[PDB]
Design a binder for these strands. Structure first.
Lengths: 181, 50, 94, 107, 195, 51, 189, 537
RNA sequence: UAAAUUAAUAAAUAAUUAUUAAACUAAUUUUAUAUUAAUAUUAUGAAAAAUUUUUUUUUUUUUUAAUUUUU
C-alpha cells in the first residue's frame, strides 16, 4: 500500500493530527499546489494555520471531526461550522469559485486532497482525500493538494470508522492542525 | 477625542503651616467630569445648529 | 511587565532620570505628553488581571439594570397581546 | 493656559511632506528659491493658514529628500533643517516683522 | 488536603447538638470538629486523640455530673454512637427549628386554599433541615386530622420518631416517642409560591 | 427559519445582512468566472497563434 | 511570556498618545500627502479572489551613474542635468496602467488635481463629534456598479451604497482608506 | 518508571552554583541602587484663592512640577581592581535576556560578562550564580529587577585584579539542584524504591536536550544544513525555531514563510519593524537586515546591491550549534554504543584503561583484567570519547570497539545525523572542550522528602523570600523547615491553579515530590532523574 | 417603564428615557438573550414601628375559546 504522488517544493505543506476513537494515530502532512491554485491553497492553508480572525465561525480545523467517510471512495472533513457537515464557509468571508482544472488540479489520483463544495462553483471549507481513482470527479472538484506523509493514517480512518452510507462508526477528528514547512 | 482638562488639586490657603512644599500640589491637569464637558461644549455647537 | 507590588499611578508629576542623549528637552517633553494621558513615556503596562474590572461593570451594570426589573418577560405587563396586536405605546411622564 | 498675547510667536504648521508632494506634482519649480510667495500663488497652502509669523516646516514621517531644495521659511524644526541640508539643498529662517510679510506676499 | 486547622475532628467526650442547653444525653461521644471550636478542649467535651485515647475515653456521664462512666471504642460502640446521636440529631433540629411556609391564600385569607398534605411537610423537613423522613411518621394534631393543615399563622403537628427503645433514650428529652414540629405559614403571592 | 438567537436585534439584523450579501456575492462570483474563463482562453488565442 | 519583562514597549494605540517611533505595527501610514505603501495590506489584496490582477509589488515601487550610480530623478551623467518629475521621497508616482493587456476594466478612477485617490473618510453627524465614520469615492467613472462589486469582495460586511457620482462605504475608518488605495494602486490606477 | 509533571511554575526547580573555589554562591543582599539628584525641583506659583488677579494681596501657593533630574551616580575603581566577582539571581531569565539587560540599562558590552550558563540548562528555572565583570560596584544594582516579580537582582562581592580573571570564572564545581515534582503517580513508598536505585546505581550522563532545542528543527539541522552547501536550508531552520520559541516571531514568520514572490522583503521589513519596536538586541540581531538585503538583491537586482544566502547566514548567532551542540549530538550516540556494548560492568576487554590521568590520580585503576576490576567495577565512571573528532583521542575504556564502530561511520558521513564536519581542522585541533564527560554518574547527597497528599499544589520557597524573610539562605540540602511550602492554598498565583486543573485532568496523581542533589558540573538534572520518573511538560 | 446620588491632592463610567450610529469570539441545547458609543435629558418630594391576589388600558373583520354554583 504505497501512494504514488507528484513531488515538488516551494509549496504550502500542511500537517494534521488525526485521532479516531480517541486513539492518537499520527500526523498527516499535505502538499498544497500553490503552483496551479493560488486561492484555494490560501483558503485551505489559512484554516490550518488558525491565524485568521473569527468571522462567520472560528476558522480553524483543530477539533472538527471528519464526517463523511465512505470506505474506499472519499474521506471528508473540514466543516468549521456546524460540525455535522451542513455548512460551508471560507476565510475570504464568502464561498469562492474554483480556479483551474487544467494541470495537477483536474485529475483526482489516489494521492489527492480535493476541495469539496456545495455548489459546483462556490467552494468552501470542506475537503476530502480521494482514496481511489475517481474518474468522475475530474474538473468537477478542484483538486488542491496531495498527502505526503501519513497515508497509512487516512487508510486507517477509512477502515476503522467507515460505512457505505458515510456516517462514522467512531469519531475521527483533527486533534491539531498546523503548517509544516 | 476632545477632553477638557483643568488644573487638579486643592486650593485652600492655610495659615503659616504648609510644611511640605515638595508633596504640595503636583501641578497635574486632570480632565473635568464627563457631564460638564458636554454642558460647556453644548454652548459651542449652537453656532450652526441643524 | 508583571507588577507584583502596589504598582503606582502614572507619570503625572515626573522626576526625570536621564541616561544620555540630546536630552536637553526631556522635562519639556515629559510634561507635554503627560496631560493627554499618553505614551512618549512608554506607559508602563501594569496589572495583567484587568479582566476583573471588565467583569465588574459587567455585573455593576447587570445588577443595576436589573434594579429596574431586567425583564426578559416582555414589554412588561403585556396581558393584552398574547391574543394578537401591535402594541402602540404609553408615554412615560414617570 | 494658552493666552495668545500680542507678540507670541505661534507659527502655523506646514508639513514638509506637503511640500515634497507639490514639487513632483509640478506646482513648485525646484530650480528656484522656494519662498512664501510661491506657496500662496501655487495654491500649495491657502492664505487663511498664513498669519504672522508665517509658517513652520515640520519633518514628521519623512526621512529623505532626494533633490536639493532651497527654502525660506520661518523657523523650520531641527530634523526639517537637517533633512534639507543633507540633500545638498539649504534652508534659511526668514523671520520678519508683520509689514515684512505683507511687503513679501503681495509684491 | 484535610485543611490545616480549619478542621480537626478530634474524638469526643460529650454534648454535641449545640443549643442553649445542649448536654441532653446519657453517656456517649459525638461532636463537631473543634477547628477553632477547640474551645471544647478547655474544660472537656472533647479530648485530643492519642494512642491511649483511641482505645477508650471518659465520656461525660450525666448520672454523676462528671465524666465518670468509662466507654470503650470498639465497633459496637461506634456503631451504637451514630445510631444513637443521629436519632436525637433529628430531635434537636425539629424541636429547636421553626420551618416557614411560603403558601398561597386568596381573598383575605385566614386559611389556605390548598391545604397541606403530609407529603407536603415531609418535603420541607428535608428541604430546610435536610432531615429525610417517612411522611407517614407525621401525625397531624387531633384538631385537623381530616382537613390537612389548611391554616395560616402558627400551626404545629406531631412528627413521630419511632426509635426510642432500641437506643435506650429516655428522660433526656421531654417526649420519647414523638416530637412537636412547629410551622408558620405565610401568604405568598403568585410570584411567591406554586400550588 | 429564524436561524439562531443572537444577542441584540442589531446583531440579528447585521447577521441577516451578511446572508443577503453571500447571495449577491455568489451571483457575482459566478459571473466573475465567466469573465475569468473567457479571458484565459482568449488569453491563449494570442499565444496559441504564436505556436 | 511575562518572564520577558520587556515587551511593555508594545502597548496600544487607544487610550494613549501614538507618535514617532511608537506607531502601531498594524496601523498603516498612508496619509493624504505621504503615499506610503505596505506589504501586509498588499497580500490581503493579492490573496483575495478577484478579477483584475493587481500589479506586482515589485513593479509597484516608487521607493525601495557618474559617481557610482545616481538617483532615480535622472540626475544625468554629468551629475548635473536632472529632470523634474522623476524621483519623489514622498511616494508619488503616476499610474502604471492595468497589468493584464487582454482585459478591459469596467471602471476608471480619476486622480484629483493634486494626484490623490477619491476616498475620503467622513463622520456621521460631525456636529456631536460622533466616532462613526464612512467613506466616499467621489471620482469614480465607468461602470461604477461593477466597481461596487469589487468592493464587496474586499469589504463583504460593509454597507456599500452607490450613486451616480460617488460610492459610499459605511463604517470604514482611516484604515479602510489605506486598504482602498493599495487596491487602486495595484489596479494600475 | 512512574510519571511526573515538572516546570509548571518558574520555581518547580532550583539551582545554585557551587564554584571550584569551595563554598558555592549563596545570595544574601539586594541593593536597589544609588542615584544623584542633579537639579532642584522646578516648581510654580499657582493661585490658591478665588480672588481676582488685580488684588495686591494674592496668595500664590507653590505647586511642584518636576522633582529634578537624576543620574546613574557612577563610582570609582579600587586603584587596580577592575574585575567584579558578583552574585546574582536569575529566575526565569535566560542569559541572553540578562546579557542584554546589563546593556539595556548600564551598557556592559557583551564581551564584558563571564557567566557560565548552568548545564541543565533549562532556561526558565530559578538560579543563583557568581559572575565576573569590569564595572564598578555602584552601577551594578542599577541593572536588577528589584521591584518586579521573579526579581533578577545583582549584588557585588567583587573587586579583583585583572590577573585574577583566569583564576576566577574557571568553571562551576557542582550545582545544588533543589527540584520539586508535580502530579506524580507513585506514593511515598514507590518513589523511595525508584530513587534509591537512582542515588546508588547512578544515571547515564547524557547530554541534556536543552543544548539541542526541543523544536522541529534541532541545532544540528542548522550546523548541517549550513554545510550541505545549502545556506537557505539553515537560515529558515534558524528562523523556524524563533517562530517556535516566542509568539513574537511566529506570526511574522508565517506571513513571510508564505508571502508572495512579489511582496517578499516586505514581510521581512514588517518583521524587522516589530522586532525593532518591541526593542530586541537589534545590534546582535542583524540577520533580518541581511535577509531583507537578500530579497532586495532580487526584485530590482539593479537598484540595490547583490546579496547571497551565504552572506545572510554569515551574520547569525552561531557557535552555539557548530561546536557545543553539534559535537554534543554524536557524543550521546557514543554512549548508545557503550550501552549496546553493555557498560554497567566496565568492558575494557583489551585493558585500555583511561589515560586521561586527571592529575595525580583518577586513572582507571590501570591494571590487569581483574586488577583493573579492583576499582574499575566501581569506576564505571569514564569519559567515553572526547566530544567530536577527538573521539579517537580518548576512545579510552573499550578496545575502542565503539570507536571502531563509529569512526568508520564518523568521518564517512557523521554516524547518527549523516552530516557533520569531522574535517581535519576541527575540535581535534582546538583544545577548549577537555572532554571528561563521564558515561555513568551519580547524584551526591540525595534523600529529599516526598508528599503523599498534595492533591493540588505546593510552592518551593526560594532565595528571594529567604533573603527577605530575614532568613539564612545557605541550606546546602533540602531544608524543609523553610523552602518547602506544604500545601495551604498559596501556590503563588490564581492562574497557576488553573494550570493545575487542566493538567490534573489529563494526568492524575498525588504529588509534591520534593528533591535535592549536588549534581556535578555538566549533568543536566532532568537527564539525571530521567530514568527515575517519566518527566512530562 | 423608579431608576439614580461620595463638595473639596494620583481612585474606570450618575441614572433614565430619547435621537443617531456600532460589533460576535476561550463562554453547550443544532436553546435563549437590547450589549456598546456619541449627543439630548438631573426636583415629582414619606414620618415612625417591625425585620436580619393578578397579567392587564388596548384590540382590522368575520368565526372560533378550557377559570359556576347557597344556606
Amino acid at each position: 500500500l504505497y501512494m504514488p504522488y507528484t513531488p515538488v517544493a516551494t509549496n504550502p505543506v500542511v500537517y494534521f493530527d488525526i485521532t479516531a476513537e480517541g486513539d492518537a494515530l499520527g500526523r498527516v502532512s499535505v502538499e498544497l499546489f500553490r503552483d496551479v491554485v493560488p486561492r484555494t491553497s490560501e483558503n485551505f492553508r489559512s484554516l490550518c494555520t488558525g491565524e485568521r480572525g473569527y468571522g462567520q465561525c472560528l476558522l480553524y480545523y483543530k477539533g472538527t471531526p471528519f464526517h463523511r467517510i465512505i470506505p474506499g471512495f472519499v474521506m471528508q472533513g473540514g466543516d468549521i461550522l456546524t460540525k455535522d457537515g451542513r455548512s460551508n464557509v471560507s476565510v475570504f468571508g464568502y464561498p469562492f469559485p474554483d480556479e483551474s482544472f487544467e494541470g495537477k488540479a483536474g485529475k483526482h489520483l489516489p494521492g489527492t486532497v480535493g476541495m469539496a463544495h456545495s455548489g459546483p462553483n462556490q467552494n468552501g471549507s470542506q475537503f476530502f482525500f480521494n482514496l481511489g481513482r475517481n474518474e468522475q470527479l475530474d474538473r468537477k472538484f478542484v483538486v488542491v493538494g496531495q498527502v505526503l506523509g501519513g497515508w497509512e493514517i487516512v487508510n486507517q480512518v477509512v477502515k476503522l470508522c467507515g460505512s457505505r452510507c458515510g456516517t462514522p462508526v467512531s469519531r475521527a477528528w483533527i486533534s491539531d492542525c498546523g503548517q509544516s514547512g | 477625542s476632545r477632553v477638557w482638562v483643568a488644573l487638579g488639586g486643592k486650593m485652600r490657603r492655610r495659615r503659616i503651616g504648609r510644611q511640605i512644599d515638595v508633596k504640595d500640589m503636583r501641578y497635574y491637569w486632570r480632565p473635568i467630569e464627563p457631564q460638564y464637558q458636554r454642558l460647556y461644549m453644548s454652548r459651542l455647537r449652537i453656532k450652526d445648529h441643524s | 511587565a508583571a507588577a507584583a507590588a502596589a504598582a503606582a499611578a502614572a507619570a503625572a508629576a515626573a522626576a526625570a532620570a536621564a541616561a544620555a542623549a540630546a536630552a536637553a528637552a526631556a522635562a519639556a517633553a515629559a510634561a507635554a505628553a503627560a496631560a493627554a494621558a499618553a505614551a512618549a513615556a512608554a506607559a508602563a503596562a501594569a496589572a495583567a488581571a484587568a479582566a476583573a474590572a471588565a467583569a465588574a461593570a459587567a455585573a455593576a451594570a447587570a445588577a443595576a439594570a436589573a434594579a429596574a426589573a431586567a425583564a426578559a418577560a416582555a414589554a412588561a405587563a403585556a396581558a393584552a397581546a398574547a391574543a394578537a396586536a401591535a402594541a402602540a405605546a404609553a408615554a412615560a411622564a414617570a | 493656559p494658552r493666552n495668545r498675547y500680542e507678540g507670541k510667536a505661534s507659527f502655523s504648521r506646514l508639513s514638509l511632506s506637503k511640500l515634497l508632494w507639490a514639487v513632483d506634482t509640478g506646482r513648485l519649480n525646484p530650480n528656484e528659491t522656494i519662498t512664501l510667495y510661491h506657496l500662496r500663488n501655487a495654491k500649495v497652502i491657502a492664505d487663511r493658514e498664513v498669519v504672522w509669523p508665517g509658517m513652520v516646516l515640520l519633518a514628521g514621517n519623512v526621512e529623505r529628500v532626494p533633490y536639493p531644495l532651497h527654502i525660506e521659511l520661518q523657523n523650520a524644526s531641527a530634523k526639517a533643517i537637517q533633512l534639507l541640508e543633507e540633500a545638498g539643498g539649504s534652508f534659511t529662517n526668514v523671520y520678519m516683522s508683520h509689514e515684512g510679510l505683507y511687503q513679501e506676499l503681495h509684491p | 488536603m484535610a485543611p490545616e486547622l480549619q478542621l480537626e475532628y478530634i474524638p469526643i467526650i460529650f454534648t454535641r447538638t449545640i443549643l442553649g442547653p445542649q448536654g441532653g444525653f446519657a453517656g456517649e461521644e459525638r461532636l463537631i470538629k473543634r477547628e477553632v471550636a477547640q474551645k471544647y478542649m478547655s474544660e472537656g467535651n472533647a479530648v485530643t486523640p492519642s494512642a491511649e485515647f483511641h482505645q477508650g475515653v471518659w465520656c461525660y456521664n450525666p448520672d454523676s455530673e462528671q465524666y465518670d462512666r468509662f466507654v470503650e471504642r470498639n465497633a459496637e460502640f461506634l456503631d451504637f454512637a451514630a445510631r444513637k446521636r443521629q436519632w436525637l440529631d433529628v430531635y434537636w433540629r425539629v424541636n429547636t427549628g421553626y420551618l416557614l411556609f411560603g403558601r398561597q391564600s386568596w381573598g383575605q385569607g385566614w386559611l389556605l386554599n390548598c391545604p397541606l398534605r403530609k407529603k407536603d411537610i415531609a418535603q420541607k423537613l428535608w428541604e430546610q433541615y435536610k432531615v429525610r423522613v417517612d411522611p407517614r411518621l407525621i401525625e397531624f394534631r387531633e384538631k385537623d386530622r381530616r382537613t390537612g393543615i389548611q391554616d395560616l399563622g402558627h400551626n404545629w403537628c406531631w412528627l413521630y420518631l419511632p426509635g426510642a427503645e432500641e437506643l435506650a433514650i429516655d428522660r433526656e428529652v421531654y417526649d420519647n416517642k414523638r416530637v412537636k414540629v412547629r410551622m408558620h405559614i405565610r401568604k405568598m403571592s403568585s410570584y411567591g409560591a406554586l400550588y | 427559519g429564524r436561524g439562531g438567537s443572537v444577542a441584540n436585534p442589531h446583531m440579528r439584523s447585521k447577521m441577516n445582512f451578511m446572508r443577503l450579501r453571500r447571495m449577491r456575492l455568489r451571483d457575482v462570483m459566478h459571473r466573475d468566472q465567466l469573465e475569468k474563463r473567457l479571458l484565459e482562453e482568449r488569453h491563449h488565442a494570442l499565444q496559441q497563434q504564436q505556436q | 511570556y511575562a518572564h520577558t519583562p520587556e515587551l511593555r514597549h508594545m502597548a496600544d494605540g487607544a487610550a494613549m498618545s501614538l507618535s514617532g517611533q511608537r506607531i502601531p505595527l498594524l496601523k498603516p501610514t498612508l496619509s493624504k500627502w505621504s503615499r506610503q505603501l505596505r506589504s501586509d495590506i498588499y497580500d490581503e489584496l493579492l490573496k483575495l479572489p478577484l478579477r483584475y490582477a493587481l500589479h506586482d509589488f515589485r513593479t509597484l515601487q516608487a521607493h525601495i551613474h557618474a559617481s557610482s550610480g545616481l538617483s532615480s530623478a535622472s540626475p544625468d551623467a554629468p551629475a548635473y542635468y536632472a529632470v523634474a518629475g522623476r524621483d519623489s521621497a514622498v511616494g508619488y508616482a503616476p499610474p502604471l496602467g492595468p497589468a493584464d493587456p487582454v482585459d478591459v476594466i469596467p471602471f476608471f478612477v480619476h486622480r484629483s488635481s493634486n494626484g490623490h485617490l477619491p476616498g475620503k473618510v467622513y463622520s456621521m453627524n460631525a456636529k456631536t463629534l460622533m466616532p462613526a465614520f464612512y467613506m466616499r469615492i467621489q471620482n469614480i467613472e465607468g461602470d461604477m456598479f461593477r466597481f461596487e462589486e469589487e468592493l464587496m469582495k474586499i469589504f463583504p460586511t460593509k454597507k456599500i451604497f452607490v450613486r451616480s457620482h460617488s460610492v459610499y462605504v459605511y463604517n470604514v475608518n482611516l484604515d479602510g482608506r489605506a486598504v482602498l488605495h493599495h487596491w487602486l494602486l495595484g489596479l494600475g490606477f | 518508571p512512574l510519571e511526573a509533571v515538572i516546570r509548571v511554575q518558574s520555581t518547580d526547580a532550583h539551582v545554585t552554583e557551587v564554584d571550584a573555589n569551595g563554598g558555592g554562591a549563596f545570595l544574601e543582599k539586594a541593593p536597589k541602587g544609588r542615584w544623584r539628584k542633579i537639579s532642584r525641583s522646578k516648581t510654580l506659583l499657582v493661585e490658591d484663592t478665588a480672588t481676582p488677579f488685580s488684588n495686591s494681596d494674592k496668595s500664590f501657593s507653590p505647586r511642584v512640577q518636576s522633582y529634578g533630574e537624576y543620574v546613574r551616580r557612577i563610582g570609582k575603581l579600587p586603584e587596580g581592581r577592575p574585575l567584579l566577582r558578583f552574585a546574582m539571581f536569575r529566575d526565569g531569565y535566560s542569559l541572553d535576556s540578562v546579557c542584554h539587560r546589563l546593556r539595556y540599562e548600564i551598557g556592559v558590552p557583551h564581551d564584558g560578562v563571564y557567566l557560565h550558563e548552568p548545564p541543565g540548562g533549562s532556561f526558565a528555572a530559578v538560579t543563583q550564580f557568581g559572575v565576573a565583570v569590569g564595572v564598578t560596584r555602584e552601577q551594578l544594582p542599577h541593572a536588577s529587577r528589584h521591584y518586579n516579580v521573579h526579581a533578577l537582582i545583582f549584588d557585588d562581592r567583587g573587586y579583583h585584579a585583572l590577573d585574577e580573571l583566569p583564576r576566577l570564572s574557571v568553571a562551576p564545581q557542582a550545582y545544588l539542584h533543589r527540584i520539586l515534582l508535580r502530579c506524580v503517580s507513585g506514593d511515598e513508598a514507590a518513589v523511595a524504591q525508584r530513587l534509591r536505585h537512582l542515588s546508588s546505581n547512578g544515571f547515564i550522563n547524557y547530554f541534556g536536550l536543552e543544548s539541542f532545542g526541543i523544536g522541529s528543527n534541532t541545532l544540528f539541522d542548522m550546523a548541517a544544513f549550513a554545510f550541505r552547501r545549502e545556506p537557505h536550508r539553515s537560515v529558515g531552520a534558524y528562523l523556524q525555531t524563533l517562530a517556535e520559541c516566542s509568539p513574537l516571531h511566529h506570526q511574522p514568520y508565517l506571513s513571510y514563510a508564505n508571502a508572495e514572490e512579489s511582496t517578499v522583503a516586505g514581510a521581512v521589513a514588517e518583521w524587522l519593524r516589530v522586532c525593532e519596536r518591541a526593542k530586541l538586541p537589534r545590534e546582535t540581531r542583524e540577520l533580518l537586515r541581511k535577509l531583507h538585503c537578500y530579497h532586495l538583491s532580487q526584485c530590482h537586482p539593479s537598484d540595490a546591491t547583490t546579496i547571497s544566502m551565504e552572506d545572510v547566514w554569515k551574520a547569525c548567532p552561531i557557535m552555539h550549534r557548530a561546536e557545543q551542540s553539534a559535537a554534543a549530538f554524536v557524543w550521546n550516540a557514543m554512549a548508545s554504543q557503550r550501552l549496546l556494548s553493555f557498560g554497567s560492568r566496565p568492558v575494557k576487554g583489551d585493558l585500555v584503561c583511561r589515560i586521561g590521568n586527571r592529575g595525580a590520580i583518577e586513572i582507571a585503576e590501570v591494571a590487569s583484567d581483574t586488577d583493573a576490576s579492583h576499582y574499575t567495577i566501581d569506576d564505571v565512571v569514564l569519559p567515553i570519547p572526547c566530544g567530536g573528532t577527538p573521539a579517537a583521542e580518548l576512545r579510552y575504556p573499550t578496545h575502542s570497539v565503539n570507536e571502531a564502530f563509529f569512526t568508520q561511520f564518523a568521518k564517512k558521513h557523521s554516524l547518527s545525523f549523516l552530516f557533520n564536519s569531522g574535517v581535519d581542522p576541527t575540535p581535534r585541533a582546538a583544545a577548549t572542550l577537555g572532554p571528561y564527560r563521564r558515561l555513568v554518574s551519580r547524584p551526591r547527597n540525595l534523600q529529599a522528602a516526598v508528599l503523599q497528599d498534595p492533591s493540588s499544589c505546593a510552592a518551593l520557597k526560594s532565595d528571594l523570600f529567604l533573603l527577605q524573610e530575614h532568613q539564612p539562605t545557605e541550606g546546602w540540602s533540602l531544608d524543609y523547615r523553610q523552602r518547602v511550602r506544604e500545601p495551604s492554598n498559596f501556590n503563588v498565583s490564581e492562574r497557576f491553579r488553573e494550570r493545575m486543573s487542566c493538567i490534573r485532568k489529563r494526568r492524575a496523581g498525588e504529588h509534591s515530590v520534593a528533591l535535592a542533589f549536588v549534581l556535578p558540573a555538566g549533568s543536566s538534572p532532568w537527564v539525571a532523574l530521567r530514568e527515575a520518573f517519566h518527566m512530562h511538560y
